[PDB]
Amino acid sequence: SIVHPDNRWYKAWTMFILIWALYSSFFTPLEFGFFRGLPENLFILDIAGQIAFLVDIVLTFFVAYRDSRTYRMIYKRSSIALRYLKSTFIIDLLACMPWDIIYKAAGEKEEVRYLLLIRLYRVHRVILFFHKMEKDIRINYLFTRIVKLIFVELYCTHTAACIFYYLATTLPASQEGYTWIGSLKLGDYSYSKFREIDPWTRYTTSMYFAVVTMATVGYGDIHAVNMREMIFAMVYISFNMILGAYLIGNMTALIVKGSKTERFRDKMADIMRYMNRNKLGRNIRGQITGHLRLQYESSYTEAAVLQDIPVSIRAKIAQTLYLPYIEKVPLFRGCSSEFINQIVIRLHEEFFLPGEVIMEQGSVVDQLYFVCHGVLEEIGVAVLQPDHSFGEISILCNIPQPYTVRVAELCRILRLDKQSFMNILEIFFHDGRRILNNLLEGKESNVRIKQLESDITFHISKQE
């Protein structure tokens, strides 16, 4: 009866065990502290949680585990237990035994309740969820990080408050003077008989010490008074420093890493340092600024995405997006299926902004271009509406293109090198003659369209 880890019912169960793991993270320290055994009522609540994890450790041999390296989903029930018995099985079993009851049976000895600290490991269940919720891309990174540190602190000071109160209670009532709380004289309130004041006061005071110690404030109203309380202040203060450096380090890691907007900062302020050097006249300055800025972000992110991912998906997504207009674009009309599908998968997007000047006179256009969307204005001569193409003039005639390319609005341009263009023809020479024969048809307007026919036969010599 193996069950998939992604099964909704088992996913709900893990969330159910999370709440029963969030309870025992913030209630096990209370059992190590103020409570020397569950009086009457917490028994049913503790045993319910224990059998909840006892059935959970039972319901782990049928849970389909999957190795990260192999990335193989394993249905083998017997092979599931190989990882569990070595990873967390030993720790988990010691966290399910009703150690409080066996504490009550072994003469109420205090040695056994020290081993109850293994139940503190259950907090790792909710930390794993924070890792998973970090893995989930839905929510903001700042929100989960701040919440994670708010939690990895709330828990640390809470477990350092229920233990510090224990270190005061490990001495008898007679020697309560040599404790951090028995000698407390906060204002006119004297914590004389701490063992019998209201439980809420002796905990909030304990949490006060942990929080004013974690943040390295240290008022000194509450402080270690004994060697055992000093030794714990040794570990806790040193540990908080490492966590404090980690929290500080993580916070500035997020700020430094969050440089997409700091890339904006870079561009703008480097132009700004150049201009603190020169106070350049701002008209052309800001115009070219806008242009470069937007074109850059566009092309850069385009490369980034089109670069990763297996080729088949890039082939398919390009077909979904580039193929429609390429099928019946003026420069590429009457082609075949494999011919259009070959070019698209290796088309490079080079978007150009409204008003951007792409090329000018005397430029050898070695990269074929196609207008996916928007109107183009070749004010060198030609107006290219959406679903148009250009740039062939310098590919086959080899004379540099005398067409100053100017964008009217939102000219989406696909770049295809002239080396890539001639590579397409040779692979499918049959369709290469068809597109050239279609190219020899009515589109004979001017030097880039009429003289096109004379240099179209140049590839005819190549393919014949």
Cα distance between residue 408 and residue 412, in whole Å: 11
Q: Indicate the residue among 259 and 445 with the shorter CB distance to a second copy.
A: 259
- 158 carries a ligand binding annotation: no
Picking from 396, 454, 392, 460, the residue whose alpha carbon sits closest to that of residue 429 is 460
Cα torsion 244, 250, 255, 256: sign: positive
Residue 263 CB partners (closer than 8 Å, separation 6+):
none
Residue 199 binds to ligand PC1 (criterion: CB under 6 A) = yes
Site for ligand PC1 in 28-57 (CB under 6 A): 30, 34-35
Residue 399 binds to a second copy (criterion: CB under 8 A) = no
Q: How far is the CB of 203 from ligand PC1 (least distance, A)?
A: 5
Cα distance between residue 78 and residue 331, in whole Å: 63
- 256 carries a ligand binding annotation: no
Residue 73 binds to a second copy (criterion: CB under 8 A) = yes
Matching residue, tokens 């014949």? 464
Q: Indicate the residue among 62 and 141 with the shorter CB distance to a second copy.
A: 141
Binding partner at 399 among a second copy, ligand PC1, none, C-beta below 5 to 8 Å by kind: none
- 40 carries a ligand binding annotation: no
What is the residue-wise DSSP string for 21-51?
HHHHHTTHHHHHTT-SS--SSHHHHHHHHHH
Binding partner at 461 among a second copy, ligand PC1, none, C-beta below 5 to 8 Å by kind: none
Backbone φ and ψ for 376, nearest 5 degrees, come out as -110, 150
Residue 77 binds to a second copy (criterion: CB under 8 A) = no
- 235 carries a ligand binding annotation: no
Cα distance between residue 104 and residue 444, in whole Å: 100
Q: How many helices (H) and strands (E) does the chain have?
A: 20, 7
Q: Indicate the residue among 238 and 463 with the shorter CB distance to ligand PC1.
A: 238
Among 150, 173, 447, 460, binds a second copy (CB under 8 A): 150
For 352, the 3-state DSSP assignment is strand
Binding partner at 110 among a second copy, ligand PC1, none, C-beta below 5 to 8 Å by kind: none
What is the residue-wise DSSP string for 415-448?
EEEHHHHHHHHHHTHHHHHHHHHHHTSS---STT
Binding partner at 269 among ligand PC1, a second copy, none, C-beta below 5 to 8 Å by kind: a second copy
Among 62, 89, 189, 458, binds a second copy (CB under 8 A): 189
Residue 26 binds to ligand PC1 (criterion: CB under 6 A) = yes
Binding partner at 257 among ligand PC1, a second copy, none, C-beta below 5 to 8 Å by kind: a second copy
Matching residue, tokens 């169960």? 13
Residue 211 binds to ligand PC1 (criterion: CB under 6 A) = no
Residue 203 binds to ligand PC1 (criterion: CB under 6 A) = yes
Annotated binding site for a nucleoside 3',5'-cyclic phosphate: 331-442
Contact residues: ligand PC1, CB under 6 A: 26-27, 30, 34-35, 158, 199-200, 203
